[PDB]
Amino acid sequence: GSSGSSGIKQHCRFCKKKYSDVKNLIKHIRDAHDPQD
Ligand SMILES: [Zn+2]
C-alpha cells in the first residue's frame, strides 16, 4: 500500500549482470573480473 518495501539492487556494472544475493556478486567478480587483484 503506502510503505517503502525494502529491495536491494545489485548489478555487475562490469558485465552489466544481475545477482539476487549480493554474496554471489562478490564471488562472481573476484572469480571473473577480480579487479582488486
Ligand atoms: Zn561481472
Domain residue extents for the chain: 10-37
Distance, CA 2 to ligand 1 centroid (Å)? 35
Amino acid symbol at 6: S
* Alpha-carbon gap, residue 32 to 23, rounded angstroms: 14
Give the DSSP per-residue string, 7-21.
----EETTTTEE-SS
Q: In angstroms, what is the span from residue 18 Cα to ligand 1's centroid?
A: 9
Residues 6 or more apart in contact with residue 27 via CB below 8 angstroms: none
Residue 25 Cα to ligand 1 midpoint, Å, equals 7
Residue with cell 552489466: 16
**Cα–Cα distance list, 29 to 2, 6, 10, 21, 24 (Å):** 36, 25, 12, 13, 9
Q: Is 1 annotated as a binding residue?
A: no
